[PDB]
Scaffold this active site. Structure first.
Site, PDB file in Angstrom:
ATOM      1  N   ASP A  82      50.030  43.391 -36.969  1.00 56.98           N
ATOM      2  CA  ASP A  82      49.841  44.708 -36.380  1.00 56.98           C
ATOM      3  C   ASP A  82      51.202  45.406 -36.272  1.00 56.98           C
ATOM      4  OD1 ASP A  82      49.545  46.895 -34.625  1.00 56.98           O
ATOM      5  OD2 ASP A  82      48.727  45.710 -32.987  1.00 56.98           O
TER       6      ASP A  82
HETATM    7  C1  LIG Z   1      59.700  47.887 -17.311  1.00 58.04           C
HETATM    8  C2  LIG Z   1      59.841  49.366 -17.663  1.00 58.04           C
HETATM    9  C3  LIG Z   1      58.589  50.232 -17.382  1.00 58.04           C
HETATM   10  C4  LIG Z   1      57.305  49.793 -18.140  1.00 58.04           C
HETATM   11  C5  LIG Z   1      56.004  50.593 -17.820  1.00 58.04           C
HETATM   12  C6  LIG Z   1      55.248  51.227 -19.039  1.00 58.04           C
HETATM   13  C7  LIG Z   1      53.687  51.037 -19.058  1.00 58.04           C
HETATM   14  C8  LIG Z   1      52.996  50.945 -20.466  1.00 58.04           C
HETATM   15  C9  LIG Z   1      51.527  50.414 -20.502  1.00 58.04           C
HETATM   16  C10 LIG Z   1      50.463  51.490 -20.885  1.00 58.04           C
HETATM   17  C11 LIG Z   1      49.278  51.032 -21.780  1.00 58.04           C
HETATM   18  C12 LIG Z   1      49.208  51.629 -23.196  1.00 58.04           C
HETATM   19  O1  LIG Z   1      49.284  50.929 -24.170  1.00 58.04           O
HETATM   20  S1  LIG Z   1      48.981  53.449 -23.424  1.00 58.04           S
HETATM   21  C13 LIG Z   1      47.505  53.823 -24.537  1.00 58.04           C
HETATM   22  C14 LIG Z   1      47.849  54.711 -25.759  1.00 58.04           C
HETATM   23  N1  LIG Z   1      46.757  54.899 -26.731  1.00 58.04           N
HETATM   24  C15 LIG Z   1      46.297  53.919 -27.615  1.00 58.04           C
HETATM   25  O2  LIG Z   1      46.837  52.812 -27.594  1.00 58.04           O
HETATM   26  C16 LIG Z   1      45.151  54.246 -28.575  1.00 58.04           C
HETATM   27  C17 LIG Z   1      45.214  53.557 -29.960  1.00 58.04           C
HETATM   28  N2  LIG Z   1      46.336  52.617 -30.058  1.00 58.04           N
HETATM   29  C18 LIG Z   1      47.324  52.716 -31.057  1.00 58.04           C
HETATM   30  O3  LIG Z   1      47.198  53.643 -31.850  1.00 58.04           O
HETATM   31  C19 LIG Z   1      48.508  51.707 -31.134  1.00 58.04           C
HETATM   32  O4  LIG Z   1      49.384  52.323 -32.015  1.00 58.04           O
HETATM   33  C20 LIG Z   1      48.137  50.320 -31.727  1.00 58.04           C
HETATM   34  C21 LIG Z   1      46.778  50.369 -32.425  1.00 58.04           C
HETATM   35  C22 LIG Z   1      48.126  49.322 -30.581  1.00 58.04           C
HETATM   36  C23 LIG Z   1      49.223  49.851 -32.812  1.00 58.04           C
HETATM   37  O5  LIG Z   1      49.116  50.600 -33.899  1.00 58.04           O
HETATM   38  P1  LIG Z   1      49.769  50.046 -35.518  1.00 58.04           P
HETATM   39  O6  LIG Z   1      48.622  49.173 -35.951  1.00 58.04           O
HETATM   40  O7  LIG Z   1      49.936  51.369 -36.227  1.00 58.04           O
HETATM   41  O8  LIG Z   1      51.046  49.343 -35.118  1.00 58.04           O
END
Ligand SMILES: CCCCCCCCCCCC(=O)SCCNC(=O)CCNC(=O)[C@H](O)C(C)(C)COP(=O)(O)O
Ligand SMILES: CCCCCCCCCCCCCCCCCC(=O)OC[C@H](COP(=O)([O-])OCC(O)COP(=O)([O-])OC[C@@H](COC(=O)CCCCCCCCCCCCCCCCC)OC(=O)CCCCCCCCCCCCCCCCC)OC(=O)CCCCCCCCCCCCCCCCC
Ligand SMILES: CCCCCCCCCCCCCCCCC[C@@H](O)O[C@H](CO[C@H](O)CCCCCCCCCCCCCCC)COP(=O)(O)OCC[N+](C)(C)C
Ligand SMILES: CCCCCCCCCCCCCCCCC[C@@H](O)O[C@H](CO[C@H](O)CCCCCCCCCCCCCCC)COP(=O)(O)OCC[N+](C)(C)C
Ligand SMILES: CCCCCCCC/C=C\CCCCCCCC(=O)OC[C@H](COP(=O)(O)OCCN)OC(=O)CCCCCCC/C=C\CCCCCCCC
Ligand SMILES: CCCCCCCC/C=C\CCCCCCCC(=O)O[C@H](COC(=O)CCCCCCC/C=C/CCCCCCCC)COP(=O)(O)OCCN
Lengths: 124, 128, 104, 70, 178, 84, 63, 175, 88, 219, 459
Positions: free
Chosen positions: I43
């Site tokens: 991924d």
């Molecule tokens: C310690 C410092 C602070 C930390 C706090 C930060 C908190 C972050 C946690 C929030 C949760 C989330 O993921 S926020 C949610 C954002 N939206 C989505 O994840 C929808 C679809 N996902 C994608 O498109 C991704 O890219 C993916 C398929 C995984 C890879 O893609 P590839 O296949 O192109 O690599």
């Protein structure tokens, strides 16, 4: 600290102001009132030119200490005895200062007691 | 929920906290595309003139000359007497002068008086 | 200029400027050598309150400690010859009042 | 001006016995000096003159009369 | 750095950049490697639970709360590689970078030393002189009308051609010239 | 003169999670249904001369033994010399 | 040999020049070099006069 | 040294203590100053002897210039430019000499402060009093003339001061 | 400094070392030209983790724009060589 | 004014130091705190003691930067302590020199920094001063110990955290000799200089038993 | 004094009878020899003056200015040799003639025992400078600049003439010696106030005073290098010299009348030093720095105490040398880059290291680093002002801080950082430029060894 707590949290008139001490006559306690004794004179204490704040009643031991250090320049460690004599005299001076502080504190206590006793007698 | 970051003049908003980037529209996308087009055209012109082996001098920059001309020589012909301009000019160009005059005049009058009574103690004051 | 992208291939890498792009009116104010406006981990007002609060408290407590000093349970240090009258200022023609030191 | 020590890539670095013996010698010298000074000069840390007790001083030597004499 | 930028960042690129930033800042917080590995696996898990969301509005409401949380807990003194734009040796060796054209101003007594180097330099200059005339025409014919839309350059198409605008990329001074 | 010895990398099969804090990290990760994939990339930090550690006070007492022995020998020799 | 020539060209010659300049030109003028009037202690004797400073007042020595 | 007058620049008789070595251990100061003497002082002394003989071979003299006294600005008519020129030059020469006098007294004071060491506050009252008197007189003469000073301005200042003194004395007499 | 002048062979070996220590990839099927997305089924999160591992193992940072389009070990090696100006 | 300025300076700089990650920044904040302590000594009217502290601080703080620079050079210009792991054995001479320097800085009986800092603390306790300035001086001493142990713990004790290719090397006579000269200084110079200079102030011969121990207790 | 005036006059036929390719060599050699001859005026007296004749007299205020004027001509010729290469022999001879005439008028101005003769020569210097600015300047603004540089001057100088003749109608003479010996107080009257203003404003405008300084940035920016050098080094000092001469008849009215000018100078030094911090042109920054330094000199002259006058003389000499050096450095950059924009050519230390050293030393002297004569004058003026009023220390220290700030800003912007990539015509520094820089800077560091030569008549 204990004295600070009794002067800041307790009664200010209970304990001295260190700036204005003493506030009572010297010969008030006992009529002997012996004098303090100084060994170093004006001229030799000037010629050794110690320091203005080192020119106290402990000066003679400092003179001896200075002379000992000067003669034995190579063996710095050799004049151990002179240093002890000087710090002992300073210890005695500090003990006398503590005695003056405690003396004036007790005199203040007795004066407050006398005035409150007189006030009680007069009101009675 | 977490405490909110409040932007200021000297501590601006982060790019990742900007609501405008999260509000996408086709008009926004075409605006970004044409901004990139302007930047790419300028970059192409600069690099075409920069990589040229025949060029043996400074590459003239119209933006820099526009900046310097606006900063220096475009000011007065674009100036108008305005209440804001008039009050600001009067304040910032007269007030400090009269303030410092008052301060120094008061100090020197006090000094002169003290010399008159003789209570200044000017002993050892030889070089002036 | 400090918060402009540092990984971009600028034509002026130190100034982070491109050739034909319009120049800010206050470019010489923002040159990474001078005032920058980059976002901070803490909000400007919070930092101002914290800095001001800390300074005010320290200043207030220094004044309080001046009001209530710390000392030792001792009387004044004593100096033999009329409180070292001739070694401090002199005037040996005046014969000052004698100060007598008490033995305890 | 030194010796030839090659990189190692994920093991403990090569150590000469010279640096080890010098480091051990100087640590031991420091501790020996501390112990020697403490043995010979303990009062530089603990003090030599006992602190008097002001509450233990009698009313006689401080010139206190029982509230009626003076 | 090398690659030309786009007009915008897509949602996936934003999520991946947030992932990298959060992991780096968690490493700054979690100094030890075992603690960092544990918390980084937890962090990856917390990303993965919304990997399959189909609603773009939901996904955009996400990443926003996430970047707000990041800005709240972002370790105001993160670890920076020494050569990175915030590092302690970022532009240390820029004062040692001298342009190649300066060698044209050398005295003949200076060029008497290093004769092979200057012969090879002359060869390079001749190659540049011819390749530039080819490059201008190739760029003019390949660029779309109305000007370029993206600052990406084409490669060489024919046998003897060189990539357009290659001289100042090939002749960089060095990463550490001295 | 430079370091040209043609250094060869160690075997990659050498590194294991076993016997390291990465083991208990993997254990606690498995308690919630996850796995650490980069564990073996960090095993070299707990393997060779890095395997044994020293405490803060132990670091402070680096040369206490031989210095203490020198102290006792010196004080005994001084006691023997001055008792004369 | 290198140390011997270094200690001559970098130590001996400068000290020679400075000693000549201080002893024969700077000291020629008054008040250019002023010393401290070394400390005098009881029991000391002085080279110039030869007289002996009297001792102190024989304070009681105990502990 | 004879190169300067001892009365203008006095010095105390310079009492120095005698070495009283209470231990038999050799102090490095004595050996080190002896080797300094041998390696430095003798070659410098010999070079000076050479230079002094060469100077003695060629002896010639220079003289200190003597200036006559001329009438001052008080004996000058209101517009007689020649006498005013003479008086102004004389007054400027006197001003320079007064500055040099103050310099001499200040040098005395500095030497006293450095020499008496830790007891300078008591053992330099003489020099302080001398400098105070000289400073007061110099200030009374030249304090406030400013740039573009002259003998006429100094005379006007003196006349104003002594008018004030006469008024004060008359007020005291008629008190 | 005294840092050896690393070569292409060293960069390739070290990149493959880091990749074989990633346990989501079987080392025997790994090759220099193997794609990350399709030849190994990783991924994009795995790809950014691999970039982070390369950064931490070579001591320098790859910017996001360049890192997000590095999909083979060979082109990772090429990027590192171009950044560090390796001759052979 | 001098006393209050020194007290606030030493407190604030030690407070900043106890949380920094750049090793050079930590040592610089340590230098600022020591300067604040020096001007506290000046403000309590003890100038010769401040001069003695200057002389001792020279030795041990110069050696502290010696060790910091050695670590930075060995780890390829890395100055962050989060990437500096187990160096107690990996490079032992820097380790022992830094331990000795930290001991001299925090104040260890009969080392170079002791003969100055201990007397500084005793003089501040036995003087007619601000209560707040005295409190802040004591807190600054405690925080000095705190940032010293922070440096040692994060740079020398744990597991390694630097990149895999190890280029650690101390075997150069220039570095070893230059560090060891200042090491001998930081061990013996305090004793030698304190016993060789003539006494320039009246000492504090008698103190309460707890108040004589206050520096060691807070450290 | 004719032993200096006659050779300067002979410089003209020698220039016009020279070969087409020997004019620079002959002019430089003989101007250097004239400077060497003029160097013997420095043997001044503690008494009145060197009264050569009824027409010319020398003073220890006039002698340093005369020597600097004679020394400036060879440097101006060396600086002008480069940009006049493509021009005809007759026009180059005319340019050298203008420089020689300027030197002659300045020399006769600084001796000038008569106040009317001083005024005539002090205004005769106007013509060569105007011709140089409006003939051999580059930009289109030069004409406008010339107009300013003209009318401002005359706007101040025409009343002075009236005042001057008025004085001679009442006193009977305008000879400086007779004026000094027969001086009388000025009563507080409206007529005397306007006489004071007519005497002061002409010299105030050419310092320039802060409110009256508009002509200076234009004139210095649009002038060629020799014009800028002579404007900053000698022509600005005419006002200070005239004030130092003329304040002898203005007492005690100076005590009251000095206040507005003192406030203007004390605030304008801060204003112009702050202006230097935000400047996109090197020449304009150097011009505003000159305005600040001359504001300090104005304060010194207005206080009229011995330390004030000594500091003002020292600062005038030091500023002349330092500003000439700074203008020469800016012109060396300009002749390569042809832009005169400070931000354009960057990181020149990596390409021109010796020129970077020259830049550093010039910035250090402008920064008033001790024991330079710049700081000697600065400190003497500051101490005199402190005695005048203790509150001047705030303004003086703020000016010092801002001066250091903008000097190091100028150094860092041009010499440090990264070189501009597209600029590839930065050729190695010529021996002529390095020699010019050394001939500016060695006199300063060598004058710091003998300060009494430039401390004026009140030393
Ligand atoms: C310690 C410092 C602070 C930390 C706090 C930060 C908190 C972050 C946690 C929030 C949760 C989330 O993921 S926020 C949610 C954002 N939206 C989505 O994840 C929808 C679809 N996902 C994608 O498109 C991704 O890219 C993916 C398929 C995984 C890879 O893609 P590839 O296949 O192109 O690599
Ligand atoms: C300190 C004691 C010195 C004693 C030795 C004698 C030195 C004589 C120097 C005379 C003046 C130098 C001439 C100026 C132009 C420089 C020529 C040049 O290009 O160099 C080529 C030459 C070859 O180098 P290169 O590789 O070919 O060129 C590469 C680049 O150029 C890159 O080159 P770079 O990177 O090496 O830089 C060149 C260098 C040189 O460039 C400069 O910046 C020099 C000018 C600095 C002064 C700035 C003006 C401020 C006012 C100070 C006035 C002091 C003058 C005193 C009288 C001098 C008489 C003429 O600049 C510096 O290094 C910066 C130094 C900053 C010093 C600031 C401190 C000033 C006050 C010091 C005390 C003064 C009073 C003491 C009183 C008490 C004691 C008695 O380099 C040198 O020789 C260096 C010059 C010497 C360094 C000067 C530093 C101190 C000297 C101060 C003046 C004399 C002090 C008298 C007291 C003696 C006791
Ligand atoms: C490259 C690295 C360095 C190599 C070189 C090393 C050597 C350095 C030594 C030189 C600098 C160190 C400073 C030491 C100075 C020694 C000489 C000095 O002491 O002599 C000065 C003497 O020099 C002069 O005072 C200063 C020179 C005057 C400068 C005139 C400028 C030249 C004309 C140029 C045109 C003018 C342009 C500016 C117009 C104002 C002061 O002496 P002074 O005690 O006082 O009396 C002289 C002797 N008496 C007693 C017989 C009377
Ligand atoms: C613009 C850039 C700078 C250019 C130069 C600026 C410097 C010029 C400033 C002029 C110096 C002072 C001028 C007058 C000073 C006299 C003192 C006066 O200010 O105080 C009061 C004067 O009172 C009033 O000022 C009376 C005059 C009122 C009319 C003046 C106009 C006010 C503003 C004009 C300023 C415009 C300047 C530019 C003109 C073009 C005291 O009153 P009094 O004690 O009883 O009389 C004193 C005079 N006696 C003794 C001779 C009789
Ligand atoms: C008084 C000062 C008045 C204000 C002066 C303003 C000067 C403006 C021009 C300065 C030039 C621009 C500049 O300096 O840039 C800011 C520059 C760079 O910022 P960095 O944090 O280093 O960023 C590095 C990472 N990018 O930082 C600075 O130097 C700014 C310094 C301004 C200081 C102002 C605060 C000083 C207040 C002091 C008050 C206390 C006095 C001491 C009391 C003494 C009692 C005994
Ligand atoms: C940079 C541009 C500045 C322009 C010039 C600024 C200077 C202005 C100074 C005044 C100009 C003329 C003054 C006269 C010259 C001196 C002559 C003199 O002092 O004689 C006076 C004469 O005094 C006058 O006549 C003065 C009249 C002034 C008229 C012109 C006014 C100009 C503007 C006035 C307001 C501004 C004043 C200061 C401006 C400063 C510059 C900004 C007394 O002589 P009597 O009258 O014969 O004897 C008394 C018994 N009857």
């Amino acid at each position: 600290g204990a004295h600070l707590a009794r002067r800041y949290l307790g009664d200010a008139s209970k304990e001295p102001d260190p700036l204005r001490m003493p506030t009572f006559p010297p010969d008030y306690g006992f009529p002997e009132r012996k004098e303090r004794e100084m060994v170093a004179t004006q001229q030799e204490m000037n010629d050794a030119q110690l320091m203005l704040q080192q020119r106290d009643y402990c000066a003679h031991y400092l003179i001896q200490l200075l002379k000992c250090k000067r003669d034995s320049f190579p063996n710095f460690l050799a004049c151990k005895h002179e240093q002890h004599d000087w710090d002992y005299c300073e210890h005695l001076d500090y003990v006398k200062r503590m005695k003056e502080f405690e003396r004036e504190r007790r005199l203040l206590q007795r004066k407050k007691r006398r005035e409150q006793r007189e006030a009680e007698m007069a009101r009675g | 929920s977490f405490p909110k970051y409040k932007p200021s003049r000297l501590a601006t908003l982060p790019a990742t906290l900007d609501p405008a980037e999260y509000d996408i529209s086709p008009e926004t996308r075409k605006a970004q595309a044409e901004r990139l087009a302007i930047r790419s055209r300028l970059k192409r012109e600069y690099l075409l003139q920069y990589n040229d082996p025949n060029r043996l001098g400074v590459i003239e920059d119209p933006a820099l000359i526009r900046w310097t001309y606006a900063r220096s020589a475009n000011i007065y012909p674009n100036f108008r007497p305005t209440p804001k301009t008039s009050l600001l000019g009067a304040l910032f160009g007269i007030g400090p002068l009269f303030f410092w005059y008052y301060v120094f005049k008061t100090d020197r009058d006090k000094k002169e008086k003290l010399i008159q009574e003789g209570k200044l103690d000017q002993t050892f004051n030889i070089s002036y | 200029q400090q918060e402009r992208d540092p990984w971009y291939d600028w034509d002026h890498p130190d100034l982070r400027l491109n050739w034909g792009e319009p120049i800010h009116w206050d470019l010489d104010m923002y040159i990474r050598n001078r005032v920058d406006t980059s976002p901070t981990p803490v909000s400007w007002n919070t930092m101002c309150k914290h800095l001001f609060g800390f300074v005010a408290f320290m200043l207030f407590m220094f004044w309080v400690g001046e009001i209530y000093p710390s000392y030792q349970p001792v009387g004044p240090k004593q100096y033999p010859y009329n409180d070292l009258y001739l070694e401090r200022g002199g005037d040996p023609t005046k014969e000052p009042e004698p100060v007598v030191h008490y033995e305890i | 001006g030194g010796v030839h020590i090659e990189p190692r890539y994920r093991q403990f670095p090569q150590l000469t016995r010279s640096q080890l013996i010098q480091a051990e010698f100087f640590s031991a010298t420091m501790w020996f000096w501390i112990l020697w000074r403490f043995w010979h000069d303990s009062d530089a840390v603990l003090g030599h003159f006992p602190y008097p007790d002001p509450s233990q001083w009698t009313d006689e030597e401080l010139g206190i009369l029982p509230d009626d004499e003076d | 750095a090398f690659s030309a930028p786009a007009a915008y960042l897509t949602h996936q690129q934003k999520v991946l950049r947030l992932y990298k930033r959060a992991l780096r800042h968690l490493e700054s917080w979690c100094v030890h490697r075992d603690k960092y590995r544990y918390f980084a696996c937890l962090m990856r898990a917390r990303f993965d639970e919304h990997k399959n969301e189909k609603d773009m509005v939901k996904a955009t409401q996400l990443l926003r709360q996430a970047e707000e949380e990041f800005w709240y807990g972002q370790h105001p003194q993160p670890y920076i590689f020494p050569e990175s734009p915030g590092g302690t040796s970022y532009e240390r060796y820029e004062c040692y970078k001298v342009p190649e054209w300066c060698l044209d101003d050398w005295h003949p007594s200076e060029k008497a030393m290093y004769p092979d180097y200057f012969a090879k330099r002359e060869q390079w200059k001749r190659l540049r002189r011819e390749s530039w005339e080819r490059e201008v025409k190739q760029l003019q014919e390949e660029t779309p009308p109305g000007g370029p839309r993206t600052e990406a350059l084409p490669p060489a198409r024919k046998e003897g051609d060189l990539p357009p605008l290659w001289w100042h990329i090939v002749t960089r001074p060095r990463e550490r010239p001295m | 003169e430079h370091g040209h010895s043609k250094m060869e990398l160690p075997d990659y099969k050498q590194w294991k999670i076993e016997g390291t804090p990465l083991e208990t990290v993997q254990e606690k990760l498995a308690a919630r249904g996850l796995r650490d994939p980069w564990g073996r990339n960090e095993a070299w930090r707990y393997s060779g001369g890095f395997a044994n550690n020293v405490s803060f006070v132990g670091a402070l007492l680096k040369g206490f033994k031989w210095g203490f022995a020198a102290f006792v020998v010196a004080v005994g020799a001084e006691y023997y010399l001055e008792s004369q | 040999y290198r140390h011997s020539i270094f200690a001559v060209t970098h130590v001996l010659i400068p000290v020679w020049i400075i000693h000549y300049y201080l002893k024969y030109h700077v000291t020629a003028k008054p008040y250019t070099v002023v010393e401290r009037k070394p400390r005098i202690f009881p029991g000391d004797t002085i080279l110039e006069t030869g007289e002996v400073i009297p001792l102190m007042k024989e304070f009681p020595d105990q502990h | 040294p004879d190169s300067w007058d001892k009365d203008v620049y006095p010095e105390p008789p310079r009492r120095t203590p005698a070495p009283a070595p209470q231990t038999s251990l050799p102090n490095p100061v004595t050996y080190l100053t002896k080797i300094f003497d041998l390696l430095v002082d003798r070659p410098v002394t010999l070079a000076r002897e050479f230079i002094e003989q060469q100077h003695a071979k060629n002896r010639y003299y220079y003289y200190h210039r003597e200036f006559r006294r001329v009438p001052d600005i008080t004996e000058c008519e209101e517009k007689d430019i020649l006498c005013m020129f003479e008086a102004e030059m004389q007054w400027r020469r006197d001003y320079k000499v007064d500055q040099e006098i103050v310099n001499i007294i200040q040098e005395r004071l500095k030497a006293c402060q450095q020499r008496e060491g830790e007891s300078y506050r008591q053992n330099c009252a003489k020099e302080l009093e001398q400098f105070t008197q000289v400073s007061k007189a110099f200030q009374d003469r030249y304090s406030d003339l400013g740039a573009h000073y002259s003998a006429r301005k100094c005379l006007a200042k003196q006349k104003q001061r002594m008018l004030a003194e006469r008024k004060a004395a008359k007020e005291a007499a008629a008190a | 400094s005294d840092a050896p002048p690393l070569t292409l062979e060293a960069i390739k070996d070290r990149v493959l070392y880091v990749l074989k220590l990633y346990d989501k990839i079987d080392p025997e099927k790994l090759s220099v030209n193997s794609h990350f997305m399709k030849d190994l089924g990783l991924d994009s999160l795995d790809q950014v983790e691999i970039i982070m591992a390369m950064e931490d193992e070579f001591g320098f940072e790859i910017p996001d724009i360049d890192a997000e389009k590095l999909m083979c070990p060979q082109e990772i090696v090429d990027y590192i060589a171009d950044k560090k100006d390796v001759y052979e | 004014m001098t006393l209050c300025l020194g007290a606030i300076t030493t407190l604030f700089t030690a407070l900043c130091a106890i949380t920094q990650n750049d090793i050079k920044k930590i040592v610089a904040f340590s230098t600022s705190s020591q300067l604040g302590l020096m001007m506290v000594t000046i403000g309590i009217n003890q100038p010769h003691l401040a001069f003695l502290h200057i002389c001792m601080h020279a030795f041990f703080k110069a050696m502290l930067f010696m060790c910091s620079g050695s670590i930075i050079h060995s780890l390829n210009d890395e100055q962050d302590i989060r990437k500096m792991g187990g160096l107690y054995k990996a490079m032992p001479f820097t380790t022992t020199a830094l331990i000795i320097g930290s001991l001299a800085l925090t104040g260890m009986p009969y080392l170079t920094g002791f003969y100055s800092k201990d007397l500084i603390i005793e003089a501040v306790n036995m003087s007619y001063t601000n209560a707040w300035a005295l409190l802040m001086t004591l807190i600054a001493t405690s925080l000095t110990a705190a940032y010293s142990t922070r440096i040692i713990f994060f740079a020398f004790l744990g597991k390694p955290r630097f990149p895999p290719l190890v280029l650690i090397n101390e075997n150069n006579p220039l570095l070893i000799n230059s560090i060891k000269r200042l090491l001998i200084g930081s061990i013996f110079a305090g004793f030698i200089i304190s016993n060789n200079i003539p006494p320039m102030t009246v000492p504090n011969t008698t103190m309460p038993l707890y108040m004589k121990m206050t520096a060691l207790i807070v450290t | 004094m004719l032993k200096i005036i006659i050779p300067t006059t002979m410089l003209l036929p020698m220039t016009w009878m020279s070969k087409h390719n020997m004019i620079w060599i002959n002019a430089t050699v003989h101007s250097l020899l004239i400077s060497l001859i003029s160097l013997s005026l420095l043997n001044q007296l503690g008494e009145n003056s060197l009264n050569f004749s009824l027409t010319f007299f020398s003073d220890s205020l006039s002698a340093p200015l005369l020597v600097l004027t004679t020394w400036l001509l060879p440097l101006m010729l060396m600086a002008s040799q480069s940009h006049l290469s493509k021009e005809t022999t007759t026009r180059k001879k005319l340019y050298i003639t203008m420089l020689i005439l300027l030197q002659l008028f300045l020399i006769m101005t600084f001796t000038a025992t008569e106040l009317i003769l001083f005024y005539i020569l002090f205004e005769a210097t106007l013509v060569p400078t105007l011709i140089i600015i409006t003939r051999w300047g580059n930009q289109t603004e030069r004409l406008n600049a010339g107009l300013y540089f003209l009318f401002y001057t005359l706007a101040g100088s025409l009343p002075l003439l009236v005042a001057l003749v008025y004085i001679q109608n009442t006193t009977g003479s305008l000879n400086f010696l007779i004026i000094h010996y027969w001086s009388h107080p000025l009563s507080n009257s409206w007529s005397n106030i306007f006489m004071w203003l007519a005497c002061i404003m002409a010299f105030m405008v050419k310092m320039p005073l802060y409110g009256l300084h508009l002509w200076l940035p234009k004139a210095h920016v649009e002038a060629p290098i020799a014009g800028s050098m002579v404007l900053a080094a000698v022509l600005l000092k005419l006002g200070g010299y005239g004030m130092m001469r003329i304040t002898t008849i203005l007492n005690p009215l100076t005590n009251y009348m000095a206040y507005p000018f003192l406030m203007l100078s004390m605030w304008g030094m801060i204003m112009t030093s702050s202006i230097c911090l935000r400047q996109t042109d090197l020449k304009s920054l150097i011009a505003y720095s000159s305005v600040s330094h001359m504001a300090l000199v104005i304060v010194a002259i207005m206080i009229q105490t011995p330390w004030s006058f000594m500091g003002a003389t020292a600062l005038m000499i030091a500023h002349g040398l330092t500003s000439s050096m700074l203008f020469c450095l800016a012109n060396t950059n300009y002749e390569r880059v042809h832009s005169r924009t400070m931000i354009l050519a960057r990181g020149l230390q990596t390409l021109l290291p010796l020129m970077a050293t020259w830049w550093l030393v010039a910035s250090l002297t402008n920064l008033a680093l001790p024991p330079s004569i710049n700081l000697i004058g600065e400190l003497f003026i500051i101490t005199a002002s402190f005695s005048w009023s203790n509150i001047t220390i705030i303004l003086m220290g703020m000016n010092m801080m801002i001066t250091a700030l903008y000097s190091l800003y100028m150094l860092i912007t041009t010499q440090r950082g990264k070189y501009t990539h597209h600029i590839n015509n930065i050729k190695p520094s010529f021996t002529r430029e390095n020699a010019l820089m050394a001939l500016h800077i060695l006199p300063l560091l060598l004058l710091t060894l003998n300060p009494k030569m430039i401390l004026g008549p009140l030393y």
